[PDB]
Structure formats: C-alpha cells, structure tokens
Write a protein that binds this ligand. Structure first.
Ligand SMILES: O=[Se](=O)([O-])[O-]
Ligand SMILES: [Ca+2]
Ligand SMILES: [Ca+2]
Ligand SMILES: [Ca+2]
Ligand SMILES: [Ca+2]
Length: 279
C-alpha cells in the first residue's frame, strides 16, 4: 500500500533514503495487534482513530486528554493519516496529568496495569506499549518497565530530550526495553535527542505531524514523537508474523537502516527504524 504526501517520518520508515514523501506498507497494517499509549490520554473521538482507540485507565479525575501529547503520540502509532500501524487497536492509559506531569508511583502502576490488562483484550498478533515519558534515574521505574516487557509486551520508551547520555534517565536506561532516540528529516540526530550505549534505535522525532485534541493536528518535536514510530512499527511487524514482543526491538535493530544518521556520538548505535517493506 502507498500513502502519498505522508508525513516525512512515515515516508522515512519505509525508505532506504531521506527526502521522499510516500509511505509504503503492507495492507495488514497492524490489524489484530494492540498498542497501549501510556501518556496524557487519547482523544478517542478524533476522526483519525476511526473507532480503534479507547481509554482503558486513568489515575485522575478524567480519562480525557486535556493536554494533547498523548493524542499526538497515539496518532503516530495508529491514526489513519499520521500513523505507522493504521489498523491497530489503541488503548490509552492516562498516567500523566493535563500538564504532562506524573508521579513515578503512578507511572509504575500504569505499567503494571498494562501487563495485566492485556489479558482482558483481544490482541492475537501481540501487544506493544509506548512510553513517551521519563525523568531522572529510578531503579523502580526501570524495574516496572522490565516487568512489562517480561510479561510479553513490546515496550518502547523515549530516550529523553536532554542531549545527554540516556543512562541517567528512566525508563530510558532500562536495558531490556526498546530505547528510542530521535532524528530529523535530513537524517541528523535531533538536536535534543539523548544518546548513549543504552539506545536501541532511532526514529523520526523532529517536526512530526500528528493528531491533537479538539479534533485537530499539529507538528511537534521530541523523543516522544520517535517512540510511537517504533511502537507502531513493532505492532506492524508482529501482525506480519516477522517477530514477537520479546524479539521485536532486536529485529528492528537488525533490519534498520545502518550508518545513515549524522551527529551520532561515538558508542551510540547508528540505526534508523525501517520496515523493509517490498511490494
Ligand atoms: O514534511 Se512534513 O509536511 O513536515 O511531514
Ligand atoms: Ca470522563
Ligand atoms: Ca554525558
Ligand atoms: Ca534495550
Ligand atoms: Ca544486549
């Protein structure tokens, strides 16, 4: 399948070269998979989600996304226009308040929640969790992410936006999950992207168009935007039967575009998420 005039990041994930604008992907499109977006919520009523999104948990007075961040990330996972995996099921877990903030205790509970809640959902092709969030190093937060992964969920987490080594941030620094850095449309490391040995992969993260609250769209930047590209890619590849939740991060690294990013510090992987889709 071909989506013309796609957001650059979608075109990038199905290309061996920067500078194209069509996204190519197998029409299965992540059908039968599920992606949990653990964030500020998801505006499930957005036409872009086509009834495939729903809120399943909140720790606050509403399950509504009063911020936009979670809706944007969910859009990059699975919206019809802005998403990687255009037929996946999206589940929102609101661990961040409408200011985009959340206590680590709440974030941990949300991860635990997903590990169990997947047993209440129909996801025959597998389960992914996307965590576009983080803060300073916490062994408890890392352990929660490790448990979620161990439970059979492909966990993708943002590296962080500190232009620093991700070793000092969580859940970025948990080795067993998929830690995602950000690139731009010219295949440069995004100016803000964290780096380091713990990164597994880069995805598009600068100037990413997606859904926003109030039935709208906007372009924003962050490792938060790169992460859902990788989460959606995992769901897509799992639906194709090419990999599993336990092995998807490694598979994505194996099959990535290699050596094509600039300003990658010595000792950080030079790997850009790629679907290797061949019609
Ligand atoms: O190229 Se675009 O319109 O910023 O995705
Ligand atoms: Ca409500
Ligand atoms: Ca450093
Ligand atoms: Ca890892
Ligand atoms: Ca290893």
């Amino acid at each position: 399948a071909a989506q013309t005039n796609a957001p650059w990041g979608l075109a990038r994930i199905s290309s061996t070269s920067p500078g194209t604008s069509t996204y190519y992907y197998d029409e299965s499109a992540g059908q039968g998979s599920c992606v949990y977006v653990i964030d500020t919520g998801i505006e499930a009523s957005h036409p872009e989600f086509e009834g495939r999104a729903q809120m399943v948990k909140t720790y606050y007075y509403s399950s509504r996304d009063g911020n936009g961040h979670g809706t944007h990330c969910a859009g990059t996972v699975g919206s019809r226009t802005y998403g990687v995996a255009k037929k996946t099921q999206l589940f929102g877990v609101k661990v961040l308040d409408d200011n985009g903030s959340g206590q680590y205790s709440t974030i941990i509970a949300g991860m635990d929640f997903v590990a169990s809640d997947k047993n209440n959902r129909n996801c025959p092709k597998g389960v992914v969790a996307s965590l576009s969030l983080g803060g300073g190093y916490s062994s408890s937060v890392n352990s929660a992410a490790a448990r979620l992964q161990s439970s059979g969920v492909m966990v993708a987490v943002a590296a962080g936006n500190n232009n620093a080594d991700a070793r000092n941030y969580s859940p970025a620094s948990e080795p067993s999950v998929c830690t995602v850095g950000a690139s731009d449309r010219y295949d440069r490391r995004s100016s803000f992207s964290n780096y380091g040995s713990v990164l597994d992969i880069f995805g598009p993260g600068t100037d990413i168009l997606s859904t926003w609250i109030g039935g709208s769209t906007r372009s924003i930047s962050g490792t938060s935007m790169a992460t859902p590209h990788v989460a959606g890619l995992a769901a897509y590849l799992m639906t194709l039967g090419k990999t599993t939740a336990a092995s998807a991060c490694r598979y994505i690294a194996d099959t990535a575009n290699k050596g094509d990013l600039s300003n990658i510090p010595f000792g950080t992987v030079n790997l850009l998420a790629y679907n290797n889709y061949q019609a």
